[PDB]
Amino acid sequence: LGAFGAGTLVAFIGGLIKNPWKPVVPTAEGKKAVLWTSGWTPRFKGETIYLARAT
Amino acid sequence: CSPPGETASSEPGTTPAIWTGSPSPAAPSGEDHGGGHGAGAAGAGETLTAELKT
Numbered sequence: 001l002g003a004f005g006a007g008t009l010v011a012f013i014g015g016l017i018k019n020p021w022k023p024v025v026p027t028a029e030g031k032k033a034v035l036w037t038s039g040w041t042p043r044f045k046g047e048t049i050y051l052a053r054a055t
Numbered sequence: 056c057s058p059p060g061e062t063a064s065s066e067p068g069t070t071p072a073i074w075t076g077s078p079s080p081a082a083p084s085g086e087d088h089g090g091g092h093g094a095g096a097a098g099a100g101e102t103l104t105a106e107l108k109t
């Protein structure tokens with residue numbers, strides 16, 4: 001019963017569990033985690049990111 | 056507690072230099088090209104201007 005409950009709970013919750021620190025967002029310094037990177041992170045070295053006003 | 060990194064009284068700074076962006080190596084596989092033409096020479100393309108002065 002303990003093993004079955006362990007397996008079932010883990011299989012129930014592992015779908016939800018995700019790594020926050022999986023490098024996914026590309027960056028000039030290689031793929032990085034989402035929290036480190038924002039829209040201002042240069043995708044490639046020397047990229048121009050204008051401070052565009054949102055009309 | 057205060058955050059480890061704060062405050063800088065010295066080193067007033069400098070005016071940022073004029074930004075000179077670089078062509079995208081990642082987004083563009085190669086170099087973006089403008090006018091298209093046969094250009095049976097070293098290469099001139101489909102864009103050629105000139106200003107005739109006095």
Ligand SMILES: CCCCCCCCCCCCCCCC(=O)O[C@H](COC(=O)CCCCCCC[C@@H](C)CCCCCCCCC)COP(=O)(O)O[C@H]1[C@H](O)[C@H](O)[C@H](O)[C@@H](O)[C@@H]1O
Pocket residue numbers: 005006009010011013014015016017018019020022
């Ligand atoms: C007693 C049980 C002993 C086992 C402990 C289990 C905890 C250790 C986990 C071991 C696996 C880690 C290495 C390999 C795996 C790995 O790297 O995955 C990580 C995440 O680990 C997972 O897989 C899922 C984690 C499992 C959920 C565990 C639930 C809590 C347990 C401890 C409580 C129930 C046990 C019974 C006790 C309570 C009894 C009741 C009184 C990160 O995911 P990520 O790289 O972002 O990819 C995402 C894919 O995982 C993701 O499933 C997928 O859905 C995507 O969303 C994807 O993005």
